Coordinates of C-alpha atoms and ligand atoms in Angstrom, one line a residue:
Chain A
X1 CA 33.4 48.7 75.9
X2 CA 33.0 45.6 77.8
X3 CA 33.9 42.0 77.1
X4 CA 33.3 39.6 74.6
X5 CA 32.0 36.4 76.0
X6 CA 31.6 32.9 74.1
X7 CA 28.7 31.7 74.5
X8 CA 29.0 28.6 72.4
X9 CA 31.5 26.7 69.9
X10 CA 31.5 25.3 66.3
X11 CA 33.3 22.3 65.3
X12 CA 33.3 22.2 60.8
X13 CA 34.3 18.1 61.2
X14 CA 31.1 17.5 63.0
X15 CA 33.5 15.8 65.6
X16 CA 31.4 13.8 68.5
X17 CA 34.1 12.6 70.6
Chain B
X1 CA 36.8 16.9 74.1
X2 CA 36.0 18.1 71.2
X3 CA 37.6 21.7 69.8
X4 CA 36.1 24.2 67.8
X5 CA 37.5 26.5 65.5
X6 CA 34.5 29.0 65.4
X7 CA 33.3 30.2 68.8
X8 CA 29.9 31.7 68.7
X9 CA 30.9 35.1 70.7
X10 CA 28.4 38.0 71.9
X11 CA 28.7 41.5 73.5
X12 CA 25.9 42.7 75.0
X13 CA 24.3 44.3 72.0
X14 CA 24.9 41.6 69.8
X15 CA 26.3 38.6 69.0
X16 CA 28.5 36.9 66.4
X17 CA 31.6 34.8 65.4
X18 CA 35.2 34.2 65.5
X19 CA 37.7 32.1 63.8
X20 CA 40.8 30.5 65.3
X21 CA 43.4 30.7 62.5
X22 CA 47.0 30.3 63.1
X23 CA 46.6 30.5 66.7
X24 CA 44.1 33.8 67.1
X25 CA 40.9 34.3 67.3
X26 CA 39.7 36.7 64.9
X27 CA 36.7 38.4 64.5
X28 CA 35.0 41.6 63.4
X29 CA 35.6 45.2 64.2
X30 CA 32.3 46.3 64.2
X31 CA 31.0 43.4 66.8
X32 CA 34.2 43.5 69.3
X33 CA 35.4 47.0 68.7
X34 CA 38.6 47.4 70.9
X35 CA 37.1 44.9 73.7
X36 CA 38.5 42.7 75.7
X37 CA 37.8 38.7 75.5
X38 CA 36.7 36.8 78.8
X39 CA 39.0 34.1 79.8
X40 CA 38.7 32.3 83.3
X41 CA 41.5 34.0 84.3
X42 CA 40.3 37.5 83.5
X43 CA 39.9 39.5 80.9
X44 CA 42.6 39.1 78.1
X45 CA 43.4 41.7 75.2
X46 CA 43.3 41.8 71.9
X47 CA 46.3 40.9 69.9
X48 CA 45.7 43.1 67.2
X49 CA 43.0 45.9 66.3
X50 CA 42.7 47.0 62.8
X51 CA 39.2 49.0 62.4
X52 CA 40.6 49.7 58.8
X53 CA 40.9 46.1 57.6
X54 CA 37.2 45.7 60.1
X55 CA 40.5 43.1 61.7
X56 CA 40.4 42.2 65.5
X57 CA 42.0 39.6 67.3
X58 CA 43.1 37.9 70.7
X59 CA 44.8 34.9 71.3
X60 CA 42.7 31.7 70.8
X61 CA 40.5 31.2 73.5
X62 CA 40.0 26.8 75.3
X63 CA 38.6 24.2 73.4
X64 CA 39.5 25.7 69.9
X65 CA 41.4 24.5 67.4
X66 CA 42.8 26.7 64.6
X67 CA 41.9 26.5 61.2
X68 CA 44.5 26.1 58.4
X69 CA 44.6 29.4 55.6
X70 CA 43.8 28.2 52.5
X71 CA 46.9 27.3 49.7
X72 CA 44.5 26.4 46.8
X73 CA 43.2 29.6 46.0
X74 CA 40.1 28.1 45.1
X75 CA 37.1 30.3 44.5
X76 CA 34.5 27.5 45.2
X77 CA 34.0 29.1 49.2
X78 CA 31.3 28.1 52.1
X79 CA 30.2 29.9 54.7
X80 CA 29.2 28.9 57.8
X81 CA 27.0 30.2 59.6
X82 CA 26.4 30.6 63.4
X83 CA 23.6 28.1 63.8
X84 CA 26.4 25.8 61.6
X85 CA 24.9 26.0 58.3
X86 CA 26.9 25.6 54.9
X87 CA 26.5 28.0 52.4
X88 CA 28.2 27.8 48.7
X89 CA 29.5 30.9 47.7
X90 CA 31.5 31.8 44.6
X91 CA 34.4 33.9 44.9
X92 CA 33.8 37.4 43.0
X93 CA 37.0 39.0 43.8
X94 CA 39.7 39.2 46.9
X95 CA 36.9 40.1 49.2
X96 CA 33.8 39.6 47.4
X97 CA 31.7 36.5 46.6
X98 CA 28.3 35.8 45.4
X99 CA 26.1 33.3 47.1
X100 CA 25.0 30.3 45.1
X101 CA 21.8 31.0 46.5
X102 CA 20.6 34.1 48.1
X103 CA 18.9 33.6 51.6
X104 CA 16.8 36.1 53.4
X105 CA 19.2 38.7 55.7
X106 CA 18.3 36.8 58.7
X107 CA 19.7 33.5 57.8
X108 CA 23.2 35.2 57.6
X109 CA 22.6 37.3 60.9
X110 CA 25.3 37.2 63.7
X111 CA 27.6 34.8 61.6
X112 CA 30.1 37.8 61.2
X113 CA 33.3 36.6 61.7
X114 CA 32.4 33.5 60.8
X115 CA 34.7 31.7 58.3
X116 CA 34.6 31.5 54.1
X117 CA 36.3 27.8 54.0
X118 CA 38.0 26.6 50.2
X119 CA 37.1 22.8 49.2
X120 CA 40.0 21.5 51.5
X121 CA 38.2 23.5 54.6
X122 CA 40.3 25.6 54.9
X123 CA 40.4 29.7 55.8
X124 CA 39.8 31.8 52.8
X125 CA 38.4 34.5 54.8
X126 CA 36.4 35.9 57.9
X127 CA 33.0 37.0 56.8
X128 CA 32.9 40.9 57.0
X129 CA 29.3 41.7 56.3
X130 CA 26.3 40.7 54.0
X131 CA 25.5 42.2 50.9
X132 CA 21.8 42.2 50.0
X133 CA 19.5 43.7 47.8
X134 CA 16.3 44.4 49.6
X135 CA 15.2 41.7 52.0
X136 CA 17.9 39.1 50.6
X137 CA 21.4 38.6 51.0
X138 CA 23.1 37.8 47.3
X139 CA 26.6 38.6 48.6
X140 CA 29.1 38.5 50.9
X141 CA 31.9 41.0 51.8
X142 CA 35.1 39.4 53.7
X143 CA 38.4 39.7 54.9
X144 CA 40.8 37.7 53.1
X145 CA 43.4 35.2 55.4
X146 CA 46.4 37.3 53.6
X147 CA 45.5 40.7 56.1
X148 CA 45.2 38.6 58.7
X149 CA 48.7 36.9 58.4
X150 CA 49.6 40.0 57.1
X151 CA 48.3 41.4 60.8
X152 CA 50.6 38.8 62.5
Chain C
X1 CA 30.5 13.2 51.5
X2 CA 30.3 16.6 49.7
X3 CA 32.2 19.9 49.9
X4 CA 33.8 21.6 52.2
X5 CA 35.7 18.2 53.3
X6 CA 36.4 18.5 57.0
X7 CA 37.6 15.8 58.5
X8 CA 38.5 14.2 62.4
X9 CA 40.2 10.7 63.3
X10 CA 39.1 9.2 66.1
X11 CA 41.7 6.6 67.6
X12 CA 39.8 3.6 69.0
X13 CA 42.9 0.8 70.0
X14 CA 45.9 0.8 72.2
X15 CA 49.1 -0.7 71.5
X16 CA 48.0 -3.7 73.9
X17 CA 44.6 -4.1 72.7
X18 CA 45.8 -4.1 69.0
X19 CA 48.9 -6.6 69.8
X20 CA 46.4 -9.1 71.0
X21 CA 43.9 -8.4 68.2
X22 CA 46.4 -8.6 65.5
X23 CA 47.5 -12.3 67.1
X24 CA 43.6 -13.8 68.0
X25 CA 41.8 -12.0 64.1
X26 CA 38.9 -11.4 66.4
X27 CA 37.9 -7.3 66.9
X28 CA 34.8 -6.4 68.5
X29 CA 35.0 -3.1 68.4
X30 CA 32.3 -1.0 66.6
X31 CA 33.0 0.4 62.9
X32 CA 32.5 3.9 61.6
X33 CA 34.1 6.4 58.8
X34 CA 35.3 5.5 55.2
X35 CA 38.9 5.9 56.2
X36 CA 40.1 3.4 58.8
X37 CA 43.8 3.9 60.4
X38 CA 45.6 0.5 60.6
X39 CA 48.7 -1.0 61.9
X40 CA 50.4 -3.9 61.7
X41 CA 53.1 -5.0 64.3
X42 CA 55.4 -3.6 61.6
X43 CA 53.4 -0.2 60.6
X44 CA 50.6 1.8 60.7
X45 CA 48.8 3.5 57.7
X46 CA 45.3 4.1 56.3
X47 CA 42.6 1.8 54.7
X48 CA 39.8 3.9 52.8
X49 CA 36.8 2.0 52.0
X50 CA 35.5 3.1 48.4
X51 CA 32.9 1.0 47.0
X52 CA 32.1 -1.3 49.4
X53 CA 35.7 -2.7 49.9
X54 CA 38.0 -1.7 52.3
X55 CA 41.4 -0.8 50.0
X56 CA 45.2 -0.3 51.2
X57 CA 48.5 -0.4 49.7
X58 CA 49.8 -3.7 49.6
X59 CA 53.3 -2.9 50.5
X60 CA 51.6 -1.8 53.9
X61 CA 49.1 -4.5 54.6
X62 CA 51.5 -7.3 52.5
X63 CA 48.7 -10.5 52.5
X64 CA 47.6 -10.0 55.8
X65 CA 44.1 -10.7 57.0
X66 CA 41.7 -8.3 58.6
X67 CA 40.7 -8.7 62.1
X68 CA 37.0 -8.6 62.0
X69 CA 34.4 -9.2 64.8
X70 CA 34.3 -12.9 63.0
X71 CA 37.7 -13.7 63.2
X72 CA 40.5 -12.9 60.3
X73 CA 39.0 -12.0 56.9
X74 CA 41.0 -13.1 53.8
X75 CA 41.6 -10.4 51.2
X76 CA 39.6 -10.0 48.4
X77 CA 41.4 -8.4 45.8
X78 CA 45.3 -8.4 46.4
X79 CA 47.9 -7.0 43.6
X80 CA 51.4 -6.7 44.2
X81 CA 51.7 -4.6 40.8
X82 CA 48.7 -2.3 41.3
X83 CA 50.5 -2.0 45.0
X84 CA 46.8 -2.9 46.5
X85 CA 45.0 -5.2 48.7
X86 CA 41.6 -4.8 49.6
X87 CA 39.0 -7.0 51.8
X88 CA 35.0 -6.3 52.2
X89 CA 34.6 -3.1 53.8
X90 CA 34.1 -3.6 57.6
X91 CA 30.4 -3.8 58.9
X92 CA 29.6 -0.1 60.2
X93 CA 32.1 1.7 57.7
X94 CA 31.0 3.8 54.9
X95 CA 32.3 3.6 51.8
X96 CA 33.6 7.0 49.1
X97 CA 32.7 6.7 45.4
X98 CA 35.4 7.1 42.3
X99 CA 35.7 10.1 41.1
X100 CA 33.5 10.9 38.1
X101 CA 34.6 14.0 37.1
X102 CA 38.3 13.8 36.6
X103 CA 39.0 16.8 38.8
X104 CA 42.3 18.5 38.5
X105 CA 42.3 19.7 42.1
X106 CA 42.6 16.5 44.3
X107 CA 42.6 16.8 48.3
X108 CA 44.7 14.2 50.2
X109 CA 43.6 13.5 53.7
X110 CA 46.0 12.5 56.1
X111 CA 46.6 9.9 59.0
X112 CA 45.8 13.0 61.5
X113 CA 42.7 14.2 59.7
X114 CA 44.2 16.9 57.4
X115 CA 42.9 17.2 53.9
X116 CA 45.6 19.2 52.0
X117 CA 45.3 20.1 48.3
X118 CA 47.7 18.5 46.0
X119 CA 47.5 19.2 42.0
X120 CA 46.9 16.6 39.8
X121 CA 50.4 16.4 37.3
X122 CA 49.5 12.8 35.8
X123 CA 47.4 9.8 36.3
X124 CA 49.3 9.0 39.5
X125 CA 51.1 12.2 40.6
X126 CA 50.1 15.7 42.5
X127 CA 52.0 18.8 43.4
X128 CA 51.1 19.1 47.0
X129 CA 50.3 22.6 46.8
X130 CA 51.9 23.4 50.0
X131 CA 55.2 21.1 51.1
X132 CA 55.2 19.1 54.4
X133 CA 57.9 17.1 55.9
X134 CA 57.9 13.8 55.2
X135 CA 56.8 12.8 58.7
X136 CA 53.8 14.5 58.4
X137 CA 52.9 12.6 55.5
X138 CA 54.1 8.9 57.3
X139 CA 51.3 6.7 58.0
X140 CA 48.8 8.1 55.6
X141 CA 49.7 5.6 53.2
X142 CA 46.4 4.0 51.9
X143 CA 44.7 7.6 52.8
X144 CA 41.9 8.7 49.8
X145 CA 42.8 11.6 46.9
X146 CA 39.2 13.4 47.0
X147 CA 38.1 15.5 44.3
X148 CA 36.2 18.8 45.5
X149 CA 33.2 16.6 45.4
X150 CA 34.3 13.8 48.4
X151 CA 34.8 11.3 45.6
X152 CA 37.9 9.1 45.6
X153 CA 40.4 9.8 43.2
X154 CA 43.4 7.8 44.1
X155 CA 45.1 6.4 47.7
X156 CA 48.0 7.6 48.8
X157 CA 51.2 5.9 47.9
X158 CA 54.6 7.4 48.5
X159 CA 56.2 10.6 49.0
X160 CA 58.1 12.6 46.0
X161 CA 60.6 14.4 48.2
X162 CA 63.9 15.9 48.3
X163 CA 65.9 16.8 51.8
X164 CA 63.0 15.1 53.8
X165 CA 60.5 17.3 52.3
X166 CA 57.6 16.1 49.9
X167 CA 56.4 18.6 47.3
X168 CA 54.7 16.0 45.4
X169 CA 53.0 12.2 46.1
X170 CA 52.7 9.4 44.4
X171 CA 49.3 7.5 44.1
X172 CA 46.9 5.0 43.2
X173 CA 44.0 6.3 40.4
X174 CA 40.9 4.7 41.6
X175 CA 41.3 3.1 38.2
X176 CA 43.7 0.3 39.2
X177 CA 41.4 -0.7 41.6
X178 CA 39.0 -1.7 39.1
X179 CA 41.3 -3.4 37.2
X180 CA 42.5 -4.8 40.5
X181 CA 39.3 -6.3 40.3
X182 CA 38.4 -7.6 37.2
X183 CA 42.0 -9.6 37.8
Chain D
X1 CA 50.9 -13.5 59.4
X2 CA 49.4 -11.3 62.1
X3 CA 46.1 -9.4 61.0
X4 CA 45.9 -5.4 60.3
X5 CA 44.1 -4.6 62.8
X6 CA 41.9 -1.2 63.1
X7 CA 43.2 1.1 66.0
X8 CA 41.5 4.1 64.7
X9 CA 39.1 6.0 62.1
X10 CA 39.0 9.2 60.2
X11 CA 35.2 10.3 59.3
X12 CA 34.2 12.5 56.9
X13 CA 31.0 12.2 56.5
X14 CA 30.8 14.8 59.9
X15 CA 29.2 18.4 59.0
X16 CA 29.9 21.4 61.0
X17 CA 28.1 21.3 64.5
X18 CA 27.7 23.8 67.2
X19 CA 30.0 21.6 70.3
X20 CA 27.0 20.6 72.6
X21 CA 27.5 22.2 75.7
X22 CA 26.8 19.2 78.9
Ligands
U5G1 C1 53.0 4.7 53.6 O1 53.2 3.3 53.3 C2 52.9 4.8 55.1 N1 53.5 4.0 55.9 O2 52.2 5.7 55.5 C3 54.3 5.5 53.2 C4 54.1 7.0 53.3 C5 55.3 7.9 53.2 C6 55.0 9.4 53.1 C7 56.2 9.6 54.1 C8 56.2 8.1 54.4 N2 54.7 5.2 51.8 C9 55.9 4.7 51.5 O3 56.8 4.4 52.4 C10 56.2 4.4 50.1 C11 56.2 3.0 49.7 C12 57.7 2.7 49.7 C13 58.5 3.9 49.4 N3 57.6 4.9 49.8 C14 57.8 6.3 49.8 O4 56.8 7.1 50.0 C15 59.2 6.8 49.5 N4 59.1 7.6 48.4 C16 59.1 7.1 47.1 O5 59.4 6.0 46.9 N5 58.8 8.0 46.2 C17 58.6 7.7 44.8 C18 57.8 6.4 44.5 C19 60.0 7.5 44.2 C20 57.9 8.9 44.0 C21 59.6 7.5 50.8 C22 61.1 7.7 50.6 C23 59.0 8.9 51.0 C24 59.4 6.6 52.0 C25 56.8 2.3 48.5 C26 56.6 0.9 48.3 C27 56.8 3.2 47.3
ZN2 ZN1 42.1 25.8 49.8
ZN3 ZN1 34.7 14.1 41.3

């Protein structure tokens, strides 16, 4: 048992910005 | 400054998803177990555990966004995956669905806690794990948005 | 589009910038989506461009002109009756098709990007399957009805509420706005 | 009259997208 780390990110609207 | 409402998460064995939805970020039991999510602050705890329901959650990590449960009850479902693909699945029953068309295992792999969106986008469930006959996935198990608000 | 419809607004004006755009007709600025959120110095709703032709309610844009990068542009179509005005689609926009499918399950998306599911009752009516305040709903006026497709259906209208809370809305079947048209 | 002027878009022609990291 550690930690969960994000290593990256999904936007469903395909939003640039 | 965009947000996302799936973060691609990992542990050190693997890797998978997690869904913001109604301010928590949920994911699967068998890929965070009881740990604890990094935050810049420190490690932060889950919210709630649930190994029966395969349920685990924290509060929603920085640059997500949550996603809305779905009020349609639609059984038209996508799932996406973690590379961000689409796939059309057909609901089979509260936690089952078939894929429109079967992909190989590995297309689904690490997309676990991913979310099954209706038409409108929205959260119909948390993908639990792939059904597949042989080499191919047909179906998908998941975990319906009703145990998670009925976690919260 | 297609399915699942996800959606993001992306504000691109100030209160300043517009002020002085809405006065000289002349906006450089670059054009993207099929939805365009529009004000007036009296309002601010939704435009969705279906067809080639940017479309909005009339009681929203009344007989204004557009500001394009060429100056004002006069409407093209404009029908107090139907409730619509509509003037060539801005350069850079893309444009939804009708609905050809007639789809009971419609999907309104609002001024702030939400698509909510609202169920067709009539040729201009929809339970929104889950109620929102009215202010919610304020300034999506003009805002596409998709089918589960991504295909226009109708433009939002007005709000059927009760104690400041809409559990239906009132809209425009794509169909008036080829009658709109033809007129 | 004063012209509607565009202070804003919604798209939805955007897909999902993994949020480029930079
Ligand atoms: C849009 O024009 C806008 N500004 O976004 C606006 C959206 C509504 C949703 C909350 C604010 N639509 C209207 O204001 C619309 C225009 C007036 C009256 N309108 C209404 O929506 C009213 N309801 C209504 O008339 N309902 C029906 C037609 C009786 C079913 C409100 C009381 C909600 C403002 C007109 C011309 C119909
Ligand atoms: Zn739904
Ligand atoms: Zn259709």
């Amino acid at each position: 048992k550690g930690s969960v780390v994000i290593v990256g990110r999904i936007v469903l609207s395909g939003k640039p910005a | 400054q965009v947000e996302g409402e799936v973060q691609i998460v990992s542990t050190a064995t693997q890797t998978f998803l997690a869904t913001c939805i109604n301010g928590v970020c949920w994911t699967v039991y068998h890929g965070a177990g009881t740990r604890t999510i990094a935050s810049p602050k420190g490690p932060v705890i889950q919210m709630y555990t649930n190994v029966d329901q395969d349920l685990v959650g924290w509060p929603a990590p920085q640059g997500s966004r949550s996603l809305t449960p779905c009020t349609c009850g639609s059984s038209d479902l996508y799932l996406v995956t973690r590379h961000a693909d689409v796939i059309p699945v057909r609901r089979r029953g509260d936690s089952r669905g078939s894929l429109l068309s079967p992909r190989p295992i590995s297309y689904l792999k690490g997309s676990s806690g991913g979310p099954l969106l209706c038409p409108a986008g929205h959260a119909v469930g948390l993908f639990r794990a792939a059904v597949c006959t042989r080499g191919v996935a047909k179906a998908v198990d998941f975990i319906p948005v009703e145990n998670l608000e009925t976690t919260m």
